[PDB]
Amino acid sequence: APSHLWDIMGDRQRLGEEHPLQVARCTKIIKKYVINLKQIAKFVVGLGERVSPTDIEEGMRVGVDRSKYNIELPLPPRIDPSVTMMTVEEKPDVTYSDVGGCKDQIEKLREVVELPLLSPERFATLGIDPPKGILLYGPPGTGKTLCARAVANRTDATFIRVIGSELVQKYVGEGARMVRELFEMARTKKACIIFFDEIDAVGGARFDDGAGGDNEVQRTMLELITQLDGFDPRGNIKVMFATNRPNTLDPALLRPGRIDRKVEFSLPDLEGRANIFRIHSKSMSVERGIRWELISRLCPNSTGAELRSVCTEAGMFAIRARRKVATEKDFLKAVDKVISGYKKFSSTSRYMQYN
């Protein structure tokens, strides 16, 4: 059906020669334009009929006709990378209210990120500088990645999630181009959010005398630091560094001036772990008259990953243990099962804080 309407206007856009343009990047601007093709061929051209003199800029892809080369339409630069097109997500499922607890790991993030985006004129009265970067590391298993998605929901803008292993490519030097791919969209798309995940595989000095193949990774941060704070302080959006190993990072990366707000996650206390089961109490099945403060009290200090496992495994006892819904008896069985039974080995929580 839609193909019939497009065939009517397809007479001028097909038979005539317009679209068959050869796209290439412009080099020198004389106000004669020296442009190098993809086949490595240099030539000279000039403006067109409807082409504006202010549209042509240095280092921009400009399509020209293949027969007689002339400028026709400008194109946005950096057309080669296809990787960063899939790095932008849309509408994350985790909401802002999914993060439990009244502690300080919530309010501190929204003031340095969501506050300048929603109300940029609030800090303009005092004439201060909002923090460009932030710091979130914490112990493994607290759902730190869930807090990054909760910010993207309230922001209602472009979000970029970057994996630490994605920056390292299969060639030496290609990782340097991967850094500018992220910061190029910062100027193109204003008021977005970039997020780095597992930076420990990237950062750190690591010096020289080691295995010797380590000099390729250390240049990624030196390219990332240069693109963050260089000779020219070029930056707009907020930068988020996150990993599970803060001690193995670059001691320069661990110092301010690229980062101001620093928040480290901690294990919720008896009052903190209570709200963890309250946000899950609205879900599943909760028997009327059951106090969740006694369950979190019998459970020792542990990450939120093992806290949500209590409510999930409690529903598993409805089959083998011959129960309708989750009762208080099944909650006590989960204490020796979800916690005491699963300790053994290979249980992280606070086990690995360093290496």
């Binding site: 030097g173 990624t220 000779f231």
Partner: protein
């Protein structure tokens, strides 16, 4: 020219006079340097603690002098194509 000048720093005058004698004075007094028989320094190593560093004053060198500045990033000089980083 950038927006950073020497008026935004303080207490650094000990190391400021040394940077003026490297990339600053030979842009002016080089005619007087040939009379003494010496030669202008072809470069100076710039380093510091594992931190920000003196890059704040690097902008003032390209500002107050009002000369031509060329920014060259070292990590941008390594590429997969052999010889392109050397050119």
């Amino acid at each position: 020219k950038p927006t950073e000048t020497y008026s935004d720093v303080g207490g650094l005058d000990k190391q400021i006079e040394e940077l003026v004698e490297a990339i600053v004075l030979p842009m002016k007094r080089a005619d007087k340097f040939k009379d003494m028989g010496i030669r202008a320094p072809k470069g100076a190593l710039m380093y510091g603690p594992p931190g920000t560093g003196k890059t704040l004053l690097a902008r003032a060198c390209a500002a107050q002098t009002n000369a031509t500045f060329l920014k060259l990033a070292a990590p941008q000089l390594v590429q997969m194509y052999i010889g392109e980083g050397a050119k």
